[PDB]
């Protein structure tokens, strides 16, 4: 009795798709199996996302796993909410009310604000990506007013890959001489290297505002002077993660691009966890004996059973690669722990952790 | 030989629709006439906007006049760009590359930054609406870093209309005692009154960040102490505007809601100007002897003649209610002038103007 689902993947999201496939193997049973229909697309393109969503809807999927970005997030939220189709995603979380969107990614804003306070910063630069969310911006600016921080908030997004050289000049002119060397980097991974390379030096302290501090070669040179801190939602010392890596480290690269390593990007980890969440939801519908096509149809015809699937998804409580997984009624992660990292000559290390209830705890 | 166009109006945009209709009367000829197909919709709803756009596309329109907001702008940009359908709009302009979007609204950021510098402010509050754009925020924060301003940037958006009383308390606690009395208001008109009323006092200087300083009763009490400045893109002393008002002031309110007044909201003025722009573009196609249906069709079938209409629109150069109208290749207003206002016991008056080329010039 196969369960039809959609998968909407950004082009080039190879490791995430490998993790998706490994999840389907691990969490599928003999009798029950998810049957995904995959669309690879440019997620920044709202026309393309709308077309992919509608195609999935017309097929008759029971839920959609996928990604969005700043330009397409409203298409996903509005279409899911209108048609009662659940969208499970590792993409950036949103603060508004969004029925039918299950956001695998923990919120990071609280942990970031606690870390700023932990280091007792009162003046710093916040370099962010207009090609990314803005909830974190808002939260930082709003806290600055309350905490009396002096924040220099520069949208490093939309760089022509051209004037880039002449734009970092004006960037660092403001910082370098305002003797501002405390810097938060809240952008796409590549933008990190591009900014750090422009600095090279040891008097700086960077906070990397993402959930994958040790992901990829991001830390390509640990001998480089300068304090670097960040966040980690995948704890490689946890039993569940260690067992996963025992397999992931042995996979064939040809079959599973991005695997055959001892680490996994946090977005890929969340993708694997999303498969567990979906499988558990549908299994729970079966246990409870709950039996379960034109996008532009007027009037809109929402899926009648949509609310039952949405409910089952939000009620899932399991441990995964990203730790304890539990959702509130708005599809937001709750009761999750985020590990706080720190830079050392020999590598990264967990100095403490953050939870909603306790804020920051030092190890 | 009627020219089919779409019109996408926010519900309740009565004056704008009246101005649209007055434009069609003024700029239509005996032989050539625009034939609009109107959709009234919630522009914050991307599903609704997508449905309206696709319906217009399937009808076979030659262009669409309409509005978007922060939540639907990406739907409009992506669908227009993909299908080569031109969208002419008075809504907030965007900085990215957007083929096929003609933005009637001048950009205001440059004028605002020049005015801040003119008054020689170095410390001020920026009160903005999360229920509005964020380009201006970014620009102000980015300039603050360069100019060494101390900006207190408070997102006054999303007020529960409830905790409002307890939220303005914390707002003014930060300001009132930080002896910060220079204030920029960048929000929806109603939020202006709601904020000003919370202040009432004469030591304040407000800058109203919109293009309709004298629009509506915004200036409902001119005797109130406190310096107020702003921008006016409709100059009621200009010959063209005066002639328009000679008619607008006599119209029947029943037939033309929002008319029968001596002023017109800047959004309505831009709507009237959009009709002139569309009419001129199609007339120019005729002069040049240039002869001119499934949204989700795969593969996407862009309109072959789309590029000719887009070109004709961007080549239009006329004077309108919003002054000199001329576009760059990205559909952005250029060579426009914005009037700078100032508050007086007897009313508002023009102290100078701003252009991209010259920045601020004092009268």
Curated annotation (Swiss-Prot), chains A, B:
Extracellular side: 1-363
Coiled coil ranges: none
Domain of life: Eukaryota
Protein location: Cell membrane; Postsynaptic cell membrane; Postsynaptic density membrane
Purpose: Ionotropic glutamate receptor that functions as a ligand-gated cation channel, gated by L-glutamate and glutamatergic agonists such as alpha-amino-3-hydroxy-5-methyl-4-isoxazolepropionic acid (AMPA), quisqualic acid, and kainic acid. L-glutamate acts as an excitatory neurotransmitter at many synapses in the central nervous system and plays an important role in fast excitatory synaptic transmission.
Comment on protein domains: The M4 transmembrane segment mediates tetramerization and is required for cell surface expression.
Assembly with partners or alone: Homotetramer or heterotetramer of pore-forming glutamate receptor subunits. Tetramers may be formed by the dimerization of dimers. May interact with MPP4. Forms a ternary complex with GRIP1 and CSPG4. Interacts with ATAD1 in an ATP-dependent manner. ATAD1-catalyzed ATP hydrolysis disrupts binding to ATAD1 and to GRIP1 and leads to AMPAR complex disassembly. Interacts with GRIP1 and GRIP2. Interacts with NSF via its C-terminus. Isoform 1, but not isoform 3, interacts with PICK1. Interacts with CACNG2. Interacts with GRIA1 and SYNDIG1.
Family as reported in the entry's similarity comment: Belongs to the glutamate-gated ion channel (TC 1.A.10.1) family. GRIA2 subfamily.
Protein name as catalogued: Glutamate receptor 2
Organism from which the protein derives: Homo sapiens
Gene: GRIA2
Location of this fragment in the whole protein: 25 to 398 of 883
């Amino acid at each position: 009795n196969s369960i039809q689902i959609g998968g909407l993947f950004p082009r080039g999201a190879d490791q995430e798709y490998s993790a998706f496939r490994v999840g389907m193997v691990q969490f599928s049973t003999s009798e029950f199996r998810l049957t995904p229909h995959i669309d690879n697309l440019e997620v920044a393109n709202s026309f393309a996302v709308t077309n992919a969503f509608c195609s999935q809807f017309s097929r008759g999927v029971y839920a959609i796993f996928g990604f969005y970005d700043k330009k397409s997030v409203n298409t996903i939220t509005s279409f899911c909410g209108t048609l009662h189709v659940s969208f499970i995603t590792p993409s950036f979380p949103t603060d508004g009310t969004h029925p039918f969107v299950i956001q695998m990614r923990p919120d990071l804003k609280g942990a970031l604000l606690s870390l700023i306070e932990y280091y007792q910063w009162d003046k710093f630069a916040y370099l962010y990506d207009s090609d990314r969310g803005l909830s974190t911006l808002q939260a930082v600016l709003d806290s600055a007013a309350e905490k009396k921080w002096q924040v220099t908030a520069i949208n490093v997004g939309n760089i022509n890959n051209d004037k880039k050289d002449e734009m970092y000049r004006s960037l660092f002119q403001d910082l370098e001489l305002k003797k501002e060397r405390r810097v938060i980097l809240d952008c796409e991974r590549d933008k990190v290297n591009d900014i750090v390379d422009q600095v090279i030096v040891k008097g700086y302290h960077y906070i990397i505002a993402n959930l994958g501090f040790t992901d990829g070669d991001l830390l390509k040179i640990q001998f480089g002077g300068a304090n670097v801190s960040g966040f980690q939602i995948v704890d490689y010392d946890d039993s569940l993660v260690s067992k996963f890596i025992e397999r992931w480290s042995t996979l064939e690269e040809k079959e599973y691009p991005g695997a055959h390593t001892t680490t996994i990007k946090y977005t890929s980890a969340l993708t694997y966890d999303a498969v567990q969440v979906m499988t558990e939801a549908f299994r729970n519908l079966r246990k409870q004996r709950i039996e379960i096509g034109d996008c532009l149809a007027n009037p809109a015809v929402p899926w009648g059973q949509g609310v039952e699937i949405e409910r089952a998804l939000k009620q899932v409580q399991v441990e995964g690669l990203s730790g304890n997984i539990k959702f509130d009624q708005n599809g937001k992660r709750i009761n999750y722990t985020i590990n706080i990292m720190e830079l050392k000559t020999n590598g990264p290390r967990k100095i403490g952790y953050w939870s909603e209830v306790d804020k920051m705890v030092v190890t």
